[PDB]
Amino acid sequence: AFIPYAGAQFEPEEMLSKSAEYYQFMDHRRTVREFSNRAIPLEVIENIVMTASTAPSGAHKQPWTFVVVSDPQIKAKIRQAAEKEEFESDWHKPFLEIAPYLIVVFRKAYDVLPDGTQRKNYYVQESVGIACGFLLAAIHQAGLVALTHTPSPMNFLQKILQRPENERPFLLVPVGYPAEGAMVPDLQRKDKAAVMVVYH
Amino acid sequence: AFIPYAGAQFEPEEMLSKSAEYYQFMDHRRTVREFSNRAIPLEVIENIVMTASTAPSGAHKQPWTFVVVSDPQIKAKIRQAAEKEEFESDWHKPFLEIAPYLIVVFRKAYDVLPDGTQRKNYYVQESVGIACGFLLAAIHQAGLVALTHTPSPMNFLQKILQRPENERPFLLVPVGYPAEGAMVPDLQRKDKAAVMVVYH
Numbered sequence: 001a002f003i004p005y006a007g008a009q010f011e012p013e014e015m016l017s018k019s020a021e022y023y024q025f026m027d028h029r030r031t032v033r034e035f036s037n038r039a040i041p042l043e044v045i046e047n048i049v050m051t052a053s054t055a056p057s058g059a060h061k062q063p064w065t066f067v068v069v070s071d072p073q074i075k076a077k078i079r080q081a082a083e084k085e086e087f088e089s090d091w092h093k094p095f096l097e098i099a100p101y102l103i104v105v106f107r108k109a110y111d112v113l114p115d116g117t118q119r120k121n122y123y124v125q126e127s128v129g130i131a132c133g134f135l136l137a138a139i140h141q142a143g144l145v146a147l148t149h150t151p152s153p154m155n156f157l158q159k160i161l162q163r164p165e166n167e168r169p170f171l172l173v174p175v176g177y178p179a180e181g182a183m184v185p186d187l188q189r190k191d192k193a194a195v196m197v198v199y200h
Numbered sequence: 201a202f203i204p205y206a207g208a209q210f211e212p213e214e215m216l217s218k219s220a221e222y223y224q225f226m227d228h229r230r231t232v233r234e235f236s237n238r239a240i241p242l243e244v245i246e247n248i249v250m251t252a253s254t255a256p257s258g259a260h261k262q263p264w265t266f267v268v269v270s271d272p273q274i275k276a277k278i279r280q281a282a283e284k285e286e287f288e289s290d291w292h293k294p295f296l297e298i299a300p301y302l303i304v305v306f307r308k309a310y311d312v313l314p315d316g317t318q319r320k321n322y323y324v325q326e327s328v329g330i331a332c333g334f335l336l337a338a339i340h341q342a343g344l345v346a347l348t349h350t351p352s353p354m355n356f357l358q359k360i361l362q363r364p365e366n367e368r369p370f371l372l373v374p375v376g377y378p379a380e381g382a383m384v385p386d387l388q389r390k391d392k393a394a395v396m397v398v399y400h
């Protein structure tokens with residue numbers, strides 16, 4: 001069954017101002033590595049996660065699980081293992097505990113029917129990446145900051161968060177208010193000519 | 201060098217209302233497959249693409265190229281090849297020509313220094329996926345619709361858009377106004393319990 005698209009549309013003059021304003025808003029987003037431990041309602045994080053989940057996906061499978069962690073002992077154990085692994089191979093990661101939430105994104109390679117059998121999901125890495133994009137935009141929209149982080153150590157995260165075999169950690173995202181006078185590196189984003197090619 | 205983070209922050213009551221409102225906005229987004237050929241200023245698409253490019257990336261490499269195509273003969277040739285390939289293995293794809301723009305996202309596996317040598321990029325599939333997420337959010341923000349589409353035929357796209365070896369097509373995104381009375385399938389997104397797990 002099909003239903004008519006319910007979408008607001010605008011004149012070109014309004015799309016110009018909205019697209020320009022949104023670009024400027026998003027350009028202020030920076031990865032932050034120093035957090036305040038100021039409390040945030042769980043309802044804010046739920047809104048953000050379910051926004052990420054509105055992302056398109058291959059064959060509408062939504063092949064993702066978002067694990068939200070605010071429990072301080074699980075955060076401490078994840079920090080310990082993260083630090084240990086990065087040492088062996090800065091490796092100081094207090095943000096894994098100071099941030100009030102960790103969002104751990106898992107990808108689902110297949111689904112398991114209630115009858116044991118498996119069904120492949122489609123374009124999973126792309127789909128889940130897109131959803132992480134929506135996650136980060138929603139975080140920014142809410143007035144929070146985040147640290148996009150490698151999902152490591154991968155096996156430890158899978159075990160302590162008790163996720164099944166059809167899933168694997170994809171990204172790790174501390175979220176919170178920034179620390180007062182948090183600093184970021186003075187980076188410059190690529191200009192239009194270095195990222196964009198236009199045919200006519 | 202480092203510089204202080206310049207970010208607006210809000211009280212919990214305001215983050216609640218903003219995160220809730222943004223969720224509702226984003227939940228209206230739907231993949232649309234029937235476009236109007238109403239004209240859109242190139243400046244809108246540029247704003248959208250450069251918004252996508254504000255995405256975080258592994259080691260700040262921004263390992264992506266956005267190819268914007270409005271040229272009707274290139275669009276016709278891409279349509280022809282897309283349709284041909286999907287036939288052999290609906291396969292009617294008029295959107296590839298009716299949409300005023302196609303954005304073709306390429307991922308960069310490595311960079312090529314001006315001196316011939318190569319340097320690996322890091323977490324490319326994740327980084328580019330995130331950027332595609334920002335792309336789609338910016339499209340929605342502007343009041344447009346899009347069709348997130350497999351990058352196929354992969355080789356044809358690489359050739360007709362003349363991209364170098366360190367790059368590969370990642371996603372194909374028609375963008376425009378929706379057709380009047382465009383229809384979407386009557387799908388339901390997963391509920392919180394099917395996508396989200398909370399520890400304390």
Ligand SMILES: Cc1cc2nc3c(=O)[nH]c(=O)nc-3n(C[C@H](O)[C@H](O)[C@H](O)COP(=O)(O)O)c2cc1C
Nearest residue numbers: 029030031148149150256257258259260323326327
């Ligand atoms: C897939 C991915 C993985 C990342 N992993 C880490 C990480 O492990 N540690 C870290 O400090 N930053 C990590 N980052 C953040 C980048 O270093 C950061 O995005 C980049 O320096 C650009 O800064 P910006 O996001 O403020 O523009 C990651 C980013 C992405 C997209």
Ligand SMILES: Cc1cc2nc3c(=O)[nH]c(=O)nc-3n(C[C@H](O)[C@H](O)[C@H](O)COP(=O)(O)O)c2cc1C
Nearest residue numbers: 056057058059060123126127229230231348349350
């Ligand atoms: C990685 C990816 C690839 C997709 N490829 C196609 C495609 O090739 N053809 C198509 O008609 N839709 C494609 N889609 C769109 C999905 O079918 C659509 O997102 C899904 O049915 C959910 O609909 P919604 O985005 O309106 O929520 C793709 C989506 C993603 C994320």
Ligand SMILES: Oc1ccccc1I
Nearest residue numbers: 057058059060122123
């Ligand atoms: O999501 C999709 C819809 C139609 C054909 C392929 C995919 I993946």
Ligand SMILES: Oc1ccccc1I
Nearest residue numbers: 257258259260322323
């Ligand atoms: O982007 C990064 C920053 C620090 C360490 C690894 C990555 I990938």
